[PDB]
């Protein structure tokens, strides 16, 4: 099946932490990632992108220590810094196990799909969220998925969140089609 192929591709992308961690929840995260179109997963694998699952804070990892005390883009005024943030995506992907669900220190519909969408945007699609075409869609639809001072202000955030709605499950896919029809069509066409 296509889901099994996607799990095989993810086996060459996902990295588990050293030490004790919740293996069942790490498996559940992989299973949710396996719903992403295989073409994107294959491209991530070819670029040697790793999806790092973590059992502690992101900034406790040596490669993210430099973000200690840094206020993420869009998180101004929250009293929080990267120390508090459970997921990161872009040139790399790093994710705290257990923090997938919306509301666990973040507002994404799913942590791992949202972070991985940033990596797909940046690595696979050469920052398409900042293209004129997507900016035009974002101008119209970017306040229709909640969190207007974040998703509605940063097109790369609206891209990542939309991508997560499209791929998490049938209900979020349906909600995106209703709320953001142009974004939905854009994502459908990208995966063709």
């Amino acid at each position: 099946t296509t889901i099994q192929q996607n799990k095989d591709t993810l086996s060459q992308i996902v990295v588990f932490p050293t030490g004790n961690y919740d293996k069942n929840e790490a498996n559940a995260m992989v299973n949710r990632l396996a719903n992403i179109d295989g073409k994107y997963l294959n491209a991530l694998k070819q670029n040697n992108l790793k999806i790092k699952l973590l059992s502690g804070k992101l900034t406790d990892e040596k490669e993210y220590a430099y973000l200690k005390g840094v206020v993420p883009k869009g998180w101004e005024g929250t009293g929080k810094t990267w120390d508090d943030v459970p997921g990161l995506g872009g040139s790399t992907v790093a994710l705290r196990i257990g923090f997938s669900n919306k509301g666990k220190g973040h507002d994404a519909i799913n942590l791992e799909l949202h972070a991985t969408a940033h990596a797909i945007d940046h690595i696979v699609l050469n920052d398409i969220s900042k293209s004129a075409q997507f900016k035009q869609i974002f101008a119209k639809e970017g306040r229709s998925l909640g969190n207007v001072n974040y998703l509605g202000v940063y097109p790369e955030e609206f891209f990542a969140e939309s991508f997560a709605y499209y791929y998490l499950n049938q209900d979020t896919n349906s909600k995106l089609k209703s709320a953001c029809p142009q974004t939905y069509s854009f994502l459908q066409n990208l995966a063709k």
Binding site: P72, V85, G90, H106, E157
Partner: peptide, 4 residues
């Protein structure tokens, strides 16, 4: 490149 990094994004929350």
């Amino acid at each position: 490149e990094v994004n929350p």
